[PDB]
């Protein structure tokens, strides 16, 4: 929902962690050009659970999203924007033209046209040195053996949808060491009691008939032993409440 | 070949809501022309553009018919829709719906055309 | 705003040399890609001219455009007018804000 993306050149990154990650508001917005995903997949991405998520957002032009892939090659791929080899993720791209083009030429956006060496994978430079094409100096001005590092996007409305300006989303989703933190929406049923039901309160599977009582625990405790080492309470992650769990008959 | 059919009440009351279905036959609208107009024509005058749509949201309008026109679009029943909101005498036109070939440089190729509707705007 | 203006009304003897020119008002010709359309009466146009330069299959030879863009206007030139080419003309361009405009017609007629 930002109002302005950067370029892709100097494409900006945001960091998801320790919230719900509901990947289901993101269908709410307009219907995506393209929305292939490495590793994971977009039906049940909201059953796995992940560390941290990179949003990758930059503006291309238009035919230039085939090239935002796990091992493609292309100007963009190897002097913008880079993915490694084994990227874990979906790539989410829609149509902006009504937002990022304007009559008179929207000559915002950039994009770097070559570099001495390739991208490295998730590598930023950002820079305005003049690029050296031969072997005499290129200082203060491009000259006849020199050219400008960064070259303009035109995204004009008028141009057609292969050059029309894209919206690109690039999400990450790869665990280095850390345990997950990110697993999104788990909702269920609400509380049946005085009744045997099965229960699950986060990953306590058993059986049994859960009661009210006054065996008020403290803050940081969320369940109960005996001497046996079995079950006896556990309270409720919803409402804070302490409900005993004995066998039904 | 790809054609078209114009489809909806051919009389409509004054001050009413306007409301024509163009109906899509040999495919469907994800990579074919990504653009589908409606082009109007008075009896005996001249055409006159009112704007497409496109797949992914993208709306354009006529600037003198901004806020009557509406367009919509169902990619599930390939068919795209043109409103009118408030008709008048004025509006006495046959109405086409076109198809726009955007995958050159710019937009243009105005390639098919529909057979076309006339619509009553007296009641 | 970018409107085109076409003369309403036009008449030439078969096989002679006519040219259907189109001026724009408002806006540069160069900027979009003027189209040539081909509506007879009762029927729905059919496209003539795309890209300024190109013809699509099955319109004959004789149809032929062209681009002036120091008169900010364009001339739909044609070699050996018949009477199987009587119908209504119109210059389509776009505006600088993606919205596109239709020409004013012309009439066509053959007097033979």
């Known amino acids: 929902n930002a109002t302005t993306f950067a370029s892709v050149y100097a494409w900006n990154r945001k960091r998801i962690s320790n919230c719900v990650a509901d990947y289901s508001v993101i269908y709410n917005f307009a219907p995506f050009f393209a929305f292939k995903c490495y590793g994971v997949s977009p039906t049940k991405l909201n059953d796995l659970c992940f560390t941290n998520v990179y949003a990758d957002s930059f503006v291309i032009r238009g035919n230039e999203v085939s090239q935002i892939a796990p091992g493609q090659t292309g100007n963009i791929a190897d002097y913008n924007y880079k993915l490694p080899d084994d990227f874990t993720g979906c790539v989410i791209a829609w149509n902006s033209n009504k937002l990022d083009s304007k009559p008179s030429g929207n000559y915002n956006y950039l994009y770097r046209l070559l570099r001495k060496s390739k991208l490295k994978p998730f590598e930023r430079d950002i820079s305005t040195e003049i690029y050296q094409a031969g072997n005499k100096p290129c200082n203060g001005v491009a000259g006849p053996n020199c050219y400008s590092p960064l070259q303009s996007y035109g995204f004009r409305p008028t141009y057609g949808v292969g050059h029309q300006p894209y919206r690109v989303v690039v999400l990450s989703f790869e665990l280095l060491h850390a345990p997950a933190t990110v697993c999104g929406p788990k909702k269920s049923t609400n509380l049946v009691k005085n009744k045997c039901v099965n229960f699950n309160f986060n990953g306590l599977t058993g059986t049994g008939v859960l009661t009210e009582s006054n065996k008020k625990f403290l803050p940081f405790q969320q369940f109960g032993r005996d001497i046996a080492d079995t079950t006896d309470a556990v309270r409720d992650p919803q409402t804070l409440e302490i409900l005993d769990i004995t066998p039904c008959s | 070949q790809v054609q078209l059919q114009e489809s909806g009440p051919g009389l409509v009351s004054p001050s009413q809501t306007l409301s024509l279905t163009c109906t899509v036959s040999?495919?469907?609208?994800?990579?074919?022309?990504?653009?589908w107009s409606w082009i109007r024509q008075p009896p005996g005058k001249g055409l006159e553009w009112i704007g497409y749509?496109?797949?992914?949201?993208?709306?354009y309008y006529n600037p003198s018919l901004k806020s009557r026109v509406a367009i919509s679009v169902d990619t599930s029943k390939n068919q795209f829709s043109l409103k009118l909101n408030s008709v008048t005498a004025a509006d006495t036109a046959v109405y086409y719906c076109?198809?726009?070939?955007?995958?050159?440089?710019?937009?243009?190729?105005?390639?098919?055309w529909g057979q076309g509707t006339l619509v009553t705007v007296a009641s | 705003e970018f409107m085109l203006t076409q003369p309403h009304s036009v008449s030439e003897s078969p096989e002679m040399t006519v040219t259907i020119s189109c001026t724009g008002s408002?806006?540069?010709?160069?900027?979009?890609?003027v189209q040539w359309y081909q509506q007879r009466p009762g029927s729905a146009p059919t496209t003539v001219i795309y890209?300024?330069?190109?013809?699509p299959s099955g319109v004959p030879n004789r149809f032929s455009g062209s681009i002036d863009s120091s008169s900010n206007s364009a001339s739909l030139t044609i070699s050996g007018l018949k009477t199987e080419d009587e119908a209504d003309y119109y210059c389509?361009?776009?505006?600088?804000?993606?919205?596109?405009?239709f020409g004013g017609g012309t009439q066509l007629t053959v007097l033979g």
């Open positions: 076109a198809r726009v070939s955007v995958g050159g440089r710019l937009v243009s190729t105005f390639d098919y």
């Open positions: 389509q361009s776009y505006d600088n804000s993606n919205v596109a405009v």
């Open positions: 040999g495919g469907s609208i994800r990579n074919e022309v990504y653009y």
């Open positions: 749509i496109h797949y992914s949201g993208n709306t």
């Open positions: 408002s806006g540069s010709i160069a900027d979009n890609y």
């Open positions: 890209e300024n330069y190109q013809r």
